[PDB]
Amino acid sequence: VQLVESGGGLVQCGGSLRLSCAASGFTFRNSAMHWVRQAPGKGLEWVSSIWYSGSNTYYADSVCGRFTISRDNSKNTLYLQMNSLTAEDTAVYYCARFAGGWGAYDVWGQGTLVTVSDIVLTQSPATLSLSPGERATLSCRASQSVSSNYLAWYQQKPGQAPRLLIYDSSSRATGVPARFSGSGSGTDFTLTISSLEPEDFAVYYCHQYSDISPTFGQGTKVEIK
Amino acid sequence: VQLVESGGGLVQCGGSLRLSCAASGFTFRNSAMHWVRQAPGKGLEWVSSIWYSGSNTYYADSVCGRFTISRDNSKNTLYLQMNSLTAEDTAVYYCARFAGGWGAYDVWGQGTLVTVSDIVLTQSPATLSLSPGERATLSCRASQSVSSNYLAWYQQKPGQAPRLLIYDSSSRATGVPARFSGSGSGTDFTLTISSLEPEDFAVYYCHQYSDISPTFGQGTKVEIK
């Protein structure tokens, strides 16, 4: 009882591929077949399952519609139809089966690798618990230096749209009170609120617009305590 | 100066949508548009760009090929062509503007919501630094109660396939030495290695197979000290 994976290799951002699992040593037609993948450096992640007869298919949320799982009973082979491939889909792809109706995967193929061809903004603290009158201070650390302070900060309240507060690190947009000020150079930038008002509690994103592909931080939530 | 987004709503797993941004208060010709999306509960993420006239377009890595960005000056609207939609694409999509040649987004639409059609296994510790002969203990925390007979442990060595060790919390696969043992119920499960041998240093994953969508733990790495 073995499983061998074929197809796969290197593909572009958006290409297409078909994976095959050649199944021997057992009665392919009645068992259930599955695909499990593992990105490099990461953990096992389940891809898809064909459950006995065709047309009874299930996919992970991430690979729905892009991936199609098929079985040819006569050839004892299992198929995976990968379309719209993204860099996040790169991984080693295994096929896996359990004997019987349901259970744990006890047979794993050798796996076949699929490979598909930016600055990072880190914001700290994740949460800021403050009170009015207090001095909020917010940090943004770029994984690389960012030229001539092409950096901005946005305030955003639940349901409302992002609102521009600071552009080019230290200059204030229209309608933003004096309390707001930005500073910092190179890789590290700081957003300072001299005194918090009731209206000031919101999420705050730093934004870099240096290359053609801008980036955002994950946000720092300034909330009451 | 205003921006109104339309289209969007509910789509199936693999469907498509076209987003419209109705632009007033400015001369559409003179400046360039961007789409920024924000999944619910997460931060801003930049999608795509038209830079003045058509054929000058740029996309994010995750949206390669699947999205086409379009604007027609004459009707004062901006278009976003979403295909092959995944659960990862559901979000509020904004259109955004900066005056002049380039800068930070100071004009933001209201956004329009797109929604596209789960036990979490947390493993501790991430790394276990031990020496042969010592006892190892590994934990697996399910985000919700999980029945016995639906939880498994896998051993995996670099360049090899996952190896099934425990099924049904306490039952050992064939050929698994006695030192290995599992335990735990409900939300908490434990893998114990009585005495560590050379062959035992590897990564170890917990696995739950209760629904049609199995899940894996992020892994616990057991390395020599």
Author numbering:
A (entry chain G), B (entry chain A): 2 to 118, 124 to 231
From the paper:
Although changing Arg83 to a threonine substantially reduces ambiguity in predicting diabody structures, they remain significantly diverse, which limits their use in designing protein nano-assemblies. In order to reduce this structural flexibility and prevent chain shuffling, we introduced disulfide bridges between the VH1 and VH2 chains in the Fv interface. The sites of the proposed cysteines were designed initially using the “Disulfide by Design” program, with the crystal structure of diabody 6052 as template. In order to examine the structural flexibility of the disulfide-bridged diabodies, we determined the structures of three of them. All were designed by the “Disulfide by Design” program using the crystal structure of the 6052 diabody as template. Some of them were crystallized in a buffer containing a high concentration of salt and organic solvent while others were generated in a buffer containing polyethyleneglycol. This demonstrates that the introduction of a disulfide bridge can essentially freeze the structure of a diabody under a wide range of experimental conditions. The disulfide bridges we introduced were located between the Fv domains and can essentially lock-in the relative conformation of the Fv domains in the diabody.
Diabodies are among the smallest of these bispecific antibodies. They are constructed by connecting heavy-chain variable fragments (VH) and light-chain variable fragments (VL) with short “GGGGS” peptide linkers. Therefore, the two VH-linker-VL chains associate to form a dimer with two antigen binding sites, each consisting of the VH and VL fragments from the different chains.
